[PDB]
Design a protein around this motif. Structure first.
Motif, PDB file in Angstrom:
ATOM      1  N   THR A 124       0.724  -1.283   0.008  1.00 53.94           N
ATOM      2  CA  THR A 124      -0.044   0.061   0.016  1.00 53.94           C
ATOM      3  C   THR A 124       0.824   1.275  -0.031  1.00 53.94           C
ATOM      4  O   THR A 124       0.405   2.403  -0.415  1.00 53.94           O
ATOM      5  CB  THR A 124      -0.883  -0.036   1.169  1.00 53.94           C
ATOM      6  OG1 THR A 124      -0.081   0.342   2.347  1.00 53.94           O
ATOM      7  CG2 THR A 124      -1.483  -1.309   1.402  1.00 53.94           C
ATOM      8  N   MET A 125       2.079   1.293   0.430  1.00 52.24           N
ATOM      9  CA  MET A 125       3.086   2.411   0.355  1.00 52.24           C
ATOM     10  C   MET A 125       3.779   2.423  -0.687  1.00 52.24           C
ATOM     11  O   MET A 125       4.779   3.075  -0.798  1.00 52.24           O
ATOM     12  CB  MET A 125       3.728   2.139   1.974  1.00 52.24           C
ATOM     13  CG  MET A 125       3.126   3.026   2.898  1.00 52.24           C
ATOM     14  SD  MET A 125       3.631   2.731   4.584  1.00 52.24           S
ATOM     15  CE  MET A 125       3.713   4.558   5.202  1.00 52.24           C
ATOM     16  N   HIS A 126       4.062   1.463  -1.719  1.00 51.60           N
ATOM     17  CA  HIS A 126       4.634   1.190  -2.583  1.00 51.60           C
ATOM     18  C   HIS A 126       3.963   1.391  -4.078  1.00 51.60           C
ATOM     19  O   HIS A 126       4.476   2.260  -4.793  1.00 51.60           O
ATOM     20  CB  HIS A 126       5.362  -0.063  -2.812  1.00 51.60           C
ATOM     21  CG  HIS A 126       6.337   0.030  -4.039  1.00 51.60           C
ATOM     22  ND1 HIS A 126       6.252  -1.113  -4.971  1.00 51.60           N
ATOM     23  CD2 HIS A 126       7.586   0.580  -4.145  1.00 51.60           C
ATOM     24  CE1 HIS A 126       7.375  -0.982  -5.969  1.00 51.60           C
ATOM     25  NE2 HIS A 126       8.223   0.113  -5.455  1.00 51.60           N
ATOM     26  N   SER A 127       2.792   0.773  -4.234  1.00 49.38           N
ATOM     27  CA  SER A 127       2.039   1.026  -5.303  1.00 49.38           C
ATOM     28  C   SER A 127       1.147   2.213  -5.140  1.00 49.38           C
ATOM     29  O   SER A 127       0.240   2.750  -6.289  1.00 49.38           O
ATOM     30  CB  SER A 127       0.968  -0.244  -5.566  1.00 49.38           C
ATOM     31  OG  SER A 127       0.749  -0.757  -4.310  1.00 49.38           O
ATOM     32  N   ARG A 128       1.004   2.853  -3.976  1.00 51.36           N
ATOM     33  CA  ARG A 128       0.140   4.003  -3.897  1.00 51.36           C
ATOM     34  C   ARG A 128      -1.234   3.602  -3.951  1.00 51.36           C
ATOM     35  O   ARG A 128      -2.152   4.561  -4.172  1.00 51.36           O
ATOM     36  CB  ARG A 128       0.425   5.191  -4.598  1.00 51.36           C
ATOM     37  CG  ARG A 128       2.033   5.590  -4.700  1.00 51.36           C
ATOM     38  CD  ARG A 128       2.758   5.944  -3.218  1.00 51.36           C
ATOM     39  NE  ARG A 128       2.379   7.000  -2.989  1.00 51.36           N
ATOM     40  CZ  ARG A 128       3.212   7.674  -2.129  1.00 51.36           C
ATOM     41  NH1 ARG A 128       4.063   7.181  -1.327  1.00 51.36           N
ATOM     42  NH2 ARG A 128       2.817   9.017  -1.670  1.00 51.36           N
ATOM     43  N   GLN A 129      -1.749   2.275  -3.898  1.00 50.86           N
ATOM     44  CA  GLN A 129      -3.051   1.669  -4.133  1.00 50.86           C
ATOM     45  C   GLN A 129      -3.354   0.963  -2.851  1.00 50.86           C
ATOM     46  O   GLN A 129      -2.408   0.178  -2.357  1.00 50.86           O
ATOM     47  CB  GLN A 129      -3.353   1.288  -5.234  1.00 50.86           C
ATOM     48  CG  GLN A 129      -2.898   2.102  -6.421  1.00 50.86           C
ATOM     49  CD  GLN A 129      -3.938   3.068  -6.968  1.00 50.86           C
ATOM     50  OE1 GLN A 129      -4.006   4.246  -6.543  1.00 50.86           O
ATOM     51  NE2 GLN A 129      -5.059   2.710  -7.865  1.00 50.86           N
TER      52      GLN A 129
END
Lengths: 862, 862
Positions: free
Chosen positions: A357-362
């Motif tokens: 959730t903190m890498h793909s921003r989704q």
């Protein structure tokens, strides 16, 4: 003998999670887990991987990893006997730890000797019973292979960590407990890094029956926040993460704001009952200690086991502590509904999701949420909102709760890292990607992934940071070209023993029209050539014009050949030095000794170019008589006896090549006489000048007079092998400095190329640095069969940059360290959050040919 | 609803170990371990407690605890089903934790709700295999009884701790790792106390065979520092300790200077090989971070496993890090040679020894050290010296090592607490020792031990600090007298329900010669009497002279009776208040109502004494014609009617006894007529007065005039039950304040003692406060059979102090909290280091009637 005390001082900086890797149900790597999460794919399946779907009445569906029977033992130095008596959990954890270390931009050599602590979380000890049912001799090694205290120690032993290694068991909340311990040790100054992780594998169906006896397990999947929730489904995890100080991390998924732990204590509802009040107090304490405004939380990874008595209490605590004052619904979710309950490893699972959730921003969707639980008022009051579909998490704080069985609650907060990538001067020009792996297929997959990200330079930097591992650990060395007009790829198995690198500098005869014109694309090459041209300009020489717009007629002259050859050699040497190639030895032909001196550090750019210019000037100015040089096919002694008057053997190139040179008349008649007896006396056009002969007696002295006032004497290193002064005279003072006397001697005396090449080992990598591979055949015949020979340039090639990159890739594949990214501006660390994950490639690039023992169901019955 | 955040701030104070308890081989308590250690008694024996001496070829000798089949489940609220499916290690650990908590001067109520963390260290999990071999239903409770994560959580659940509860598995060194974690959590502010501990029991002989397979075990005992050492012998431990902040600890065995951990990292000798360099680096780091002078260490508890490859390395590290610069040999030792190797609990064993070495001020000897190891140089150069005999450790620092398998080392340093005891004003006068226990035999042993330490007041205070536990937890309540001329001891089982305490104040007639003369020994009683005498001196009354040198002629007058009885009542009330007895109800006879007012807080000392003085003066100042009072055994309705004019009924003593009062002529005649009919008209001396009759009309008004200017009206609490104004007028204003009107009314109106006694419950503990026990018969007949009746004084007793102490002991035995030590100056905490240990008494004072399941050898084979 005395030991310097370590400076143990409090740390007040930031702590960042850098690496992530692990095996998850129906997912062999983090990429597969991300794909499953973002595609609403259920990772809990019904099959007989562990036991029949219904054996002993256990629930049919379960969360199981793909395989638990593979382990690259020889990589970790574990013999077959030890590996066989080794828990699959520990093997998978070791592999995942290595993958996470590589993901964070670190390597085996960089992580060795650091003050890193291991905080493994493991509780499943069913392997002991399985292996002890029919215990026999040779199973003693189990102490070092199955004990839960050896899970971290092994990790500390292989990677040479010198920090607190510990194994925790707090049940369900164990992984966040390990995270808290790592934070505590990091902030006191004991360690600079942490290997927080955890594992959980299912082996014993009777354990599932015993869990069901307590009504822990439900019928269907974990329907978190659903009115029909009645339990959870067991899952398997072998994930781990790496933590570091934010000021030294090369990649930062997020920042650990803070973690806290507490206990519910005594309650009238039983020991196995969540306490909402205790959880609310814990969250209030964590959010007040760090002054974090609870209204800034964007996503909340809850401990949504799906139990009827668990979800309401967690939701009530969240609403009372976090939603107070919030102006918009708080997005809550849980990964249990996706891949089931990980048990002791559950805490890591959410962390993994958070990183995603903190890498793909989704925010991944939550599965099995159809009807909101009526006992959950928040879902109807607008305070809470379960994420049932992908949501664009822009940034902020993410909070994770990992409440555990028995009453040990844990909370953690993570702050997003917002360093969105920016364009680099590279990523549109050809680049050399060099790497190493355990198997050819894994290296090919890594190259395919790199080509997929050919437009990213941060990914290339992260890969290169661990691309110099010794062949002993990763034997399959490979090189490719990204953004290449023509496809190139080389892969080879490199022996453990390290070979010697020997730079070889060519002399005359390598000149041609368009030399180094393609290599002008590289910034370093162009800068070096510009510097050389500026240095030579005061002398009325325009190197730029000769190199760019020069024609064949210009090259026919005497000076431009020397000038251009020396400039190209210096530029190539500068490129190699910038890349970081250290030549274990240096040899050079006539006019190449200046390049050898420049590379060895005994000479400088200005001095080298002036030496070449002075050689050319002495050759041209003097009225040296009409001369001739010819490559006879005679042996050194035979040519030294056939040599008539006015004719002397100049260059002992190969064992069957001599450069017999002399006066034009004498050379002519000697040529015809040698061809009468019969030998291949080809004419070497030397601009109609006889070098390294008596005819050079006048110019050489002139050269000395020219160079006595410029070349500052400096020592010659043992790496440089002289090709002009015989070995028997090396010990004499003349063979200690490359002053004007050395230049005059090499321009006057014969070139003992064969003698110098003899010093080269039998398996050395010789790099031919010159405008063209003129001496390829000579060097190949001289050294032998076991020596690798490469040429950095090819005559009249349509793209010399590709040839340069291919030769360098071959050199790396043969086992010579280098930094392909040294030709471009250094990438600023930590890299942007948009950089892909490197853990997957290593996970799918393992050597898993062998299959090891795994606990069998039949071993749990008796 | 909002929760106040806890203040989590760094702690910079001292951390002190307060409590210690545990089961050690051939030792059921710490005292037995100390005795065996100081008597050179080997704790490893050969027998079939676990398995036959030689079964499966395992070593015959082993270190085993006395019993593991005992557990007081009812105390911890564990039902039989849960206890049966409960690890014996967990049960022993719970008992030891309670014993350690009691040892530190704490109690169940004091430790409830505190921010205490549990850091249990346990690795053994063989019970799972034993119980799952023939698994059947009803065994699901194993999740909450056998899982390792439940070892700390249970401790947190029972004692209501709200701090991080964790279970660590670090092989050997687990105890020191848990100590380090407790220090980390203490210094950061999350917790204020810690329950660091560990346990290790042996069940599976195949585990011993497995250990032998790797050459871990030797032939004979652990010959630490001996040239013949070839291994270690397994041992069993269930010990735990309590840590606290030094500024709140009531007992401080020592101070935790600091602890540190590290890992041996990678080495070429194998993972299971000690690294001397790593241990030396750890020692240097710990001794440099805290600025501790390594030359100040007096004793060194080594990890002397006795292995050939382990002892030399550890000793090398010790004399390279600690002995550098020392001017005298460093005394080294290890408890392994005494009671074998504890494995996961080994660390705690050393800590235990340290506490002993830090409590008895003597270093226990080391066994089996006959010939120094030639490989250990320090034993020949004088740098080191193994303690082979008891040594007088005066004070300083003690360092402990717990090097464990794998390479995870741990070091800790403890500083001695030097607060040698000083004499107290008590310890030579009789004292009341009150306590509670689970069994009568345990309480008797506790009393015997207390008598053994009758000259120590710090021990009495430590016992008192946990002597007020509710009967529900400890039902057997007991009381004894230390330094008593006559032996006294009472023990009784007290029901869980708490009874009501009712103070009863008697009236006139309790006068005698010597009233309170013995009670003058107590400081509080004498001070109270002196204050009353000083208050009454301005009025020409010498209370002191009457009380001490008074004669029967003195009491023949009216004034001295009133003054003395009231003074004794006030002194007894002050004593009871000082001991901390809170009366749930108050009642009193005529002239006792002033005492009830004083004890209730509505009246003051001066006001009560002056009310009594005015009562006496109102009758010795105005002329009152002679009259009499008698004790006719008529009912109130009988007597009140039977008496002629003038004669009335004064006080309703019980259901059949009535005072009658009248003029000397009316009286004599009516009493005679009565005596004719069967009635016991037993006349009572009143100085020829008839109280509580029409005759008292004139004095009462006078009394009002006397008291209207002194008694400040104050509200009467519901606890005080009026015996002069009937219930119909209690709500009326007159029965709201004990002003002069109340005094006049009670001196005039009849005394409704029976009506007041009716309000007392059926099982209330009534304490008769008066110079002598007059109303025992009346009160007993009034309340009934289920009520407890006690008199604080006995008429003409040869020692009233003993009677008072016995009365208080009975009252406590029947379930009333009190503070017997409140009669003497408070003991300054922390207590002196010479105070004995309280853990042994609780360990030997458990209820172990039932026997629970234990793993059997036959369950490990199949």
């Amino acid at each position: 003998p005395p030991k310097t005390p370590n400076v143990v001082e409090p740390y007040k900086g930031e702590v960042a999670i850098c690496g992530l890797s692990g095996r998850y149900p129906e997912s062999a790597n983090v990429g597969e887990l991300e794909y499953n999460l973002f595609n609403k794919i259920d990772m809990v399946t019904i099959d007989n991987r562990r036991w029949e779907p219904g054996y002993l009445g256990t629930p049919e569906r379960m969360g199981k990893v793909k395989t638990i029977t593979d382990f690259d033992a020889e990589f970790f130095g574990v013999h077959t006997k030890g590996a066989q008596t080794m828990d699959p959990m520990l093997r998978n954890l070791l592999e995942v730890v290595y993958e996470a270390i590589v993901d964070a931009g670190e390597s085996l050599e960089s992580m060795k000797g650091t003050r890193t602590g291991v905080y493994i979380g493991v509780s499943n000890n069913e392997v002991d019973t399985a292996y002890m049912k029919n215990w026999t001799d040779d199973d003693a090694y189990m102490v070092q292979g199955c004990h839960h205290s050896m899970y971290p120690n092994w990790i500390s032993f292989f990677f040479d960590f010198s920090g607190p290694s510990t194994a925790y068991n707090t049940a369900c909340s164990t992984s966040l407990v390990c995270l808290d311990a790592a934070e505590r040790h990091l902030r006191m100054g004991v360690i600079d890094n942490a290997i927080v992780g955890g594992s959980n594998f299912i082996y014993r169906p009777a354990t599932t029956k015993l869990f069901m006896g307590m009504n822990f397990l439900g019928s269907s999947t974990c329907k978190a926040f659903d009115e029909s929730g009645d339990g959870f489904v067991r899952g398997e995890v072998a994930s781990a993460i790496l933590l570091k100080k934010a000021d030294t991390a090369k990649r930062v998924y997020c920042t650990l704001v803070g973690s806290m732990l507490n206990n519910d204590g005594n309650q009238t509802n039983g020991i196995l009952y969540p306490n909402s009040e205790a959880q609310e107090q814990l969250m209030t304490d964590i959010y007040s200690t760090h002054k974090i405004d609870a209204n800034e939380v964007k996503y909340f990874e809850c401990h949504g086991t799906g139990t009827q008595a668990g979800d309401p209490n967690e939701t009530r605590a969240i609403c009372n502590a976090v939603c107070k004052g919030k102006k918009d619904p708080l997005l809550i979710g849980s990964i249990k509904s996706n891949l089931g309950h990980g048990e002791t490893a559950s805490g890591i699972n959410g962390i993994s999701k958070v990183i995603i959730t903190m890498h793909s921003r989704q925010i991944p969707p939550n599965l099995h949420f159809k009807n909101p639980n009526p006992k959950i008022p928040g879902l109807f009051d607008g305070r809470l909102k379960v994420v049932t579909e992908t949501t664009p998490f822009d940034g902020g704080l993410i909070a994770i709760n990992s409440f555990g069985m028995g009453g040990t609650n844990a909370h953690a907060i993570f702050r997003s890292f917002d360093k969105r990538a920016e364009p680099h001067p590279a990523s549109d020009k050809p680049r050399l990607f060099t790497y190493c792996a355990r198997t050819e297929e894994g290296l090919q997959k890594i190259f395919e992934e790199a080509h997929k990200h050919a437009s990213n330079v941060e990914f290339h930097a992260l890969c290169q940071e661990s691309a110099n591992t010794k062949p002993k650990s990763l034997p399959y060395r490979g090189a490719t070209i990204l953004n290449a007009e023509g496809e190139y790829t080389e892969i080879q198995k490199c022996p453990s023993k390290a070979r010697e690198v020997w730079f070889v500098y060519s002399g005359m005869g390598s000149q041609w029209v368009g030399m180094g014109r393609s290599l002008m694309a590289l910034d370093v090459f162009r800068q070096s050539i510009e510097e050389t041209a500026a240095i030579l300009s005061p002398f009325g020489v325009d190197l730029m014009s000769l190199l760019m717009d020069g024609t064949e007629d210009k090259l026919k002259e005497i000076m431009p050949p020397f000038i251009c050859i020396n400039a190209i050699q210096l530029a190539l040497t500068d490129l190699l030095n910038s890349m970081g190639i250290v030549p274990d030895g240096l040899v050079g032909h006539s006019l190449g000794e200046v390049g050898c001196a420049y590379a060895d550090g005994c000479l400088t750019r200005r001095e080298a170019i002036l030496s070449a210019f002075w050689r050319a000037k002495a050759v041209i100015d003097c009225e040296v008589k009409p001369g001739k040089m010819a490559a006879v096919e005679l042996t050194w002694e035979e040519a030294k006896r056939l040599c008539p008057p006015g004719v002397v053997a100049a260059c002992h190139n190969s064992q069957d090549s001599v450069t017999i040179s002399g006066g034009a008349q004498e050379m002519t008649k000697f040529m015809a006489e040698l061809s009468a007896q019969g030998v291949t006396v080809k004419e070497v056009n030397s601009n109609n000048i006889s070098y390294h002969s008596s005819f050079m007696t006048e110019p050489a002295a002139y050269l000395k007079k020219g160079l006595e006032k410029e070349i500052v004497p400096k020592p010659r290193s043992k790496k440089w092998i002289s090709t002009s002064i015989p070995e028997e005279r090396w010990g004499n003072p003349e063979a200690q400095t490359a002053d004007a006397s050395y230049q005059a001697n090499n321009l006057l005396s014969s070139v003992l190329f064969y003698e110098g090449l003899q010093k080269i080992p039998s398996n050395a990598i010789a790099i031919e640095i010159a405008p063209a591979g003129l001496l390829q055949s000579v060097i190949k015949k001289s050294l032998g069969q076991d020596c690798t020979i490469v040429a950095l340039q090819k005559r009249k090639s349509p793209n010399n940059l590709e040839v340069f990159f291919s030769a360098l890739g071959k050199c790396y594949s043969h086992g010579v360290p280098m930094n392909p990214l040294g030709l471009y501006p250094a990438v600023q660390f930590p890299v942007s959050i948009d950089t892909p994950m490197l853990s997957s490639m290593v996970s799918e690039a393992w050597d898993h040919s062998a299959k090891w023992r795994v606990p069998l169901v039949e071993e749990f019955e008796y």
